[PDB]
């Protein structure tokens, strides 16, 4: 029966009916009439539903009709939108493409998405997908989110810094703009903390997994998990008669590249009887071609009936948003690396830490997408209940708040110490944040955003970097500095397959500038530009082609940003004595707090906090510079300062006058060196 | 087929069975026509709690027979029909630990209801079998999708600890 599409006046196309049948069978569908009533009755809703419950695709579409019905019989009023946020760029796209099909309209027209570096809207857009940061990016110009009627903060469980900020402001919005609906969705079953936070808003629970999963435990507690994991993989390969791939969760590349090798050894021992096992590493910095393996199908198996299998060994990248098809065996050792930023010593850590009562589920939930499946945890069930905490900390309780305080100040939060965070940041961290901003001239001593500060918020950057870049425009080096900004705002472009480490390091040496990693990246960026951006040249020189193409994009965006505020892009003459001098000075302008000096003991100690550090062995330095500017204080096996740079102490006193003011300093070696320099300059 | 009638008890009444009855039922452990075990099992009462590790649960928290667990616990029967109390298709279960030892044929237990039960219809179960004298391992034992771990594994270790 001919229904007309209300959006384009078309008959609904022949494709839609078939899709319609399948989507009617999604679990959320029965709730359709029930949801609308709640939305009509309340301003805030909390919604919960397991993976595969169809929330993300059906709920925003049902929001759209509810907008339309509210326009029916009113005049056609000012164009308002329904927003759906999505924590990751890849998800914001993959939803929209499906949802532009379901509503039988052309993507970007009535149904769109708005992610970084690509806007797919039109003036007929009603339903806008965006990453979380973009809905944070819009508010900073329009605090009441003025274009929006129904918001939808999806995947709330991920608790990302974009999302935690939003929620608080959006509850603030729920005051004031007293017409805007909010529908907070979470995919995890979470203990209704969302329900409290938003004034006891109604909680809607929707079930909906695809298949059931079997959970398993070791009865005793194995003492060497990698030996256990490797041993577990072999055991499964040999005993399980069901076809399927094994997805093993490890901590990182030092292990996922070991585990591949050692598992290859034992399958080479098991010889002709056992089926072929193919071991595929998978971590977030593998180049595109190495990632693409995961789509590869299994062998046709050996003739004797021995099942051949693919074994994907992966960090938490396989837990969320990456959907590995064909998995029917998940091995979960129960660890992940967790950043935790220790605001007392500015040591940002990367230790192996136990997963949470949620994360355990999500790892197991990979099985049960295509057929029933089994999850093997290498820990004991009593271990599960009593050591793993119930959910993993939000991002906000874990990271440096420099980027966030500046965003909140631009949004016109003055009252940060009462800001309504769902899980508030530590007092000690915020005191680093304000202290970070106060040196940087972002905020005056009475805490208002200064003129320089308001410009610093406009850049998609961290506060230190923005101070560098702005200051680079008065040193006549902004074109060179713009690139050293772009490369440091993307995940690091060095590739090092451990099967090829020596050859890859040789490529790194050829790029290496003498004065440290910051000029080494500018050399890397220029070399990529000279070679017409040819993917091959990225490969043989062990540079991720994703990072550079992302990086060059970031640079173009920052140029556009500079132009809108009349920061002239300039260069010093390459012929000039000042060219590599003006680059290093600009760095020092903005990472002036994060500077080390070489004490007589042969170790570095970081300026003022006396924290003992070593050059991170990836540095292309071949010397210990006496004063070292560094971008990231890392805990792994030791404190390591990464991305290390030689600076000259005269720059420190001239360029960054506030912090290196001698009279404040803790009395020690750092002060002794600095004092002599100031007397010399005078 | 194998069968044991009655309720677990120590009385010499025809309506009760005991350890000795289960044992002399269990007596033919040698391979009498190659005989490994039976296709079907007919009992009155439930075993010691089918509901453990089951992907569904029965409508009532049934207790049941420790002993008949033991007879299943080596009979490993393709099917187990249990009378009394409640319908219940329990989903399957395996007959070993998983990953430790080769695959072996899975049981399915099927609870039937009384005629004229206050729910009506379900009490009659209409079904195929095919035998373990003509079936073969590549058909008989390939683990059918919904397979669970062995429900009397834990209790066997407990019940052995005193009794055997």
């Amino acid at each position: 029966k001919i229904q007309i599409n209300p959006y384009n006046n078309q008959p609904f196309s022949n494709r839609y009916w078939a899709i319609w049948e399948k989507r009617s069978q999604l679990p959320v569908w029965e709730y359709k009439e029930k949801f609308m009533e709640l939305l009509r009755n309340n301003q805030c809703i909390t919604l919960v539903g397991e993976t595969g419950s169809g929330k993300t695709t059906q709920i925003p579409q049902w929001a759209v009709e509810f907008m339309k019905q509210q326009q029916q019989g009113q005049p056609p009023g000012q164009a308002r939108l329904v927003a759906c946020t999505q924590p990751r760029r890849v998800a914001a796209m993959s939803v929209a493409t499906r949802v532009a099909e379901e509503m039988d309209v052309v993507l970007g027209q009535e149904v769109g998405y708005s992610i970084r570096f690509e806007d797919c809207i039109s003036e007929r857009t009603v339903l806008k997908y965006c990453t979380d940061g973009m809905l944070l990016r819009e508010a900073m110009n329009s605090p009441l989110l003025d274009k929006y009627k129904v918001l939808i903060l999806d995947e709330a469980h991920e608790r990302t810094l974009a999302t935690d900020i939003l929620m608080g402001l959006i509850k603030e919005i729920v005051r004031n703009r007293a017409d805007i609906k909010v529908v907070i969705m979470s995919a995890t079953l979470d203990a209704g903390k969302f329900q409290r936070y938003f004034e006891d808003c109604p909680l809607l629970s929707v079930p909906g997994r695809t298949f059931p999963v079997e959970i398993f435990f070791t009865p005793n507690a194995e003492k060497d998990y990698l030996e256990a994991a490797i041993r577990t993989v072999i055991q499964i390969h040999m005993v399980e008669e069901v076809e399927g791939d094994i997805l093993l969760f490890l901590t990182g590349q030092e292990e996922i590249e070991e585990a591949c090798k050692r598992i290859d050894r034992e399958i080479q021992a098991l010889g002709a009887d056992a089926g072929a096992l193919s071991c595929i590493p998978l971590y977030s910095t593998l180049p595109p071609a190495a990632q693409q393996r995961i789509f590869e199908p299994a062998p046709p198996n050996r003739p004797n009936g021995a099942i051949s299998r693919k074994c994907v060994i992966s960090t938490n990248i396989a837990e969320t948003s990456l959907t590995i098809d064909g998995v029917v065996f998940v091995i979960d050792p129960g660890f992940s690396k967790q950043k935790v930023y220790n605001p007392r010593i500015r040591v940002e850590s990367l230790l192996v830490c136990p997963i949470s009562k949620a994360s355990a589920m999500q790892r197991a939930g990979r099985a049960g997408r295509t057929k029933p499946g089994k999850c093997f945890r290498l820990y004991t069930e009593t271990a599960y209940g009593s050591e793993m905490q119930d959910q993993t900390y939000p991002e906000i309780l874990r990271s440096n708040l420099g980027s966030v305080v500046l965003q909140l100040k631009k949004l016109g939060t003055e009252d940060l110490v009462h800001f309504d965070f769902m899980d508030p940041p530590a007092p000690e961290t915020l005191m680093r944040a304000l202290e970070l901003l106060n040196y940087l001239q972002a905020i005056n001593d009475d805490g208002e955003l200064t003129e320089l500060g308001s410009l610093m918020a406009e850049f998609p950057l961290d506060p230190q970097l923005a101070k560098m870049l702005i200051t680079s425009t008065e040193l006549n080096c902004s074109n060179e500095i713009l690139s050293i900004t772009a490369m440091l705002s993307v995940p690091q472009c060095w590739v090092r397959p451990n099967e090829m480490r020596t050859e890859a390091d040789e490529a790194k040496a050829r790029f290496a500038h003498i004065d440290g990693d910051h000029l080494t990246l500018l050399n890397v960026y220029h070399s990529f530009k000279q070679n017409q951006e040819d993917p091959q040249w990225c490969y043989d020189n062990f540079i991720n082609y994703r990072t550079m193409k992302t990086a060059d994009t970031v640079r173009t965006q920052l140029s556009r940003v500079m132009d809108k505020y009349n920061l002239r892009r300039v260069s010093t003459d390459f012929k000039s004595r000042d060219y590599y001098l003006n680059i290093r000075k600009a760095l020092v302008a903005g990472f002036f707090m994060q500077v080390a000096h070489l004490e007589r003991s042969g170790h570095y100690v970081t300026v003022k906090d006396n924290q003992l550090v070593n050059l991170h062995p990836s540095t292309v330095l071949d010397h210990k510079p006496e004063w070292a500017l560094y971008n990231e204080f890392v805990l792994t096996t030791k404190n390591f300062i990464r991305t290390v740079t030689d600076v000259r102490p005269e720059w420190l006193l001239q360029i960054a006058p506030q912090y290196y003011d001698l009279d404040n300093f803790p009395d020690g070696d750092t002060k002794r060196k600095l004092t002599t320099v100031m007397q010399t300059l005078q | 087929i194998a069968y044991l009638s009655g309720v677990e008890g120590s009385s010499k009444d025809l309506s009760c069975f005991d350890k000795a009855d289960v044992e002399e039922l269990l007596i033919p452990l040698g391979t009498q026509v190659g005989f490994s075990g039976t296709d079907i099992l007919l009992t009155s009462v439930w075993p010691a709690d089918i509901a453990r590790h089951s992907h569904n649960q029965p409508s009532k928290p049934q207790p049941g027979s420790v002993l008949l667990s033991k007879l299943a616990a080596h009979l490993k029967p393709r099917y187990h029909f249990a009378g009394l109390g409640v319908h219940y298709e329990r989903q399957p279960y395996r007959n070993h630990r998983v990953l430790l030892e080769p695959a072996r044929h899975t049981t399915r237990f099927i609870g039937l209801a009384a005629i004229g039960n206050p729910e009506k219809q379900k009490w009659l179960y209409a079904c195929n079998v095919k035998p373990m004298r003509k079936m073969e391992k590549e058909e008989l034992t390939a683990q059918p999708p919904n397979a669970s771990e062995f429900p009397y594994r834990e209790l066997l270790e407990e019940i052995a600890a005193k009794e055997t």
């Binding site: 059931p212 079997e214 959970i215 398993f216 435990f217 070791t218 009865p219 005793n220 194995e222 256990a228 041993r231 577990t232 055991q235 093997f376 290498l378 004991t380 069930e381 | 590790h53 089951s54 992907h55 569904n56 649960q57 029965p58 409508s59 319908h87 219940y88 298709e89 329990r90 989903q91 399957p92 630990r97 998983v98 990953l99 430790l100 399915r108 099927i110 379900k122 179960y125 209409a126 079904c127 195929n128 059918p144 999708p145 919904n146 669970s148 771990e149």
Partner: peptide, 23 residues
């Protein structure tokens, strides 16, 4: 080698399964 042990979560207090495929 590694010792398996189970602990599975209940789905529903219910009453059907495999038999259509078991038949």
């Amino acid at each position: 080698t590694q010792v398996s042990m189970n602990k599975g979560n209940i789905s529903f207090v219910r009453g059907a399964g495999k038999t259509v495929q078991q038949n």
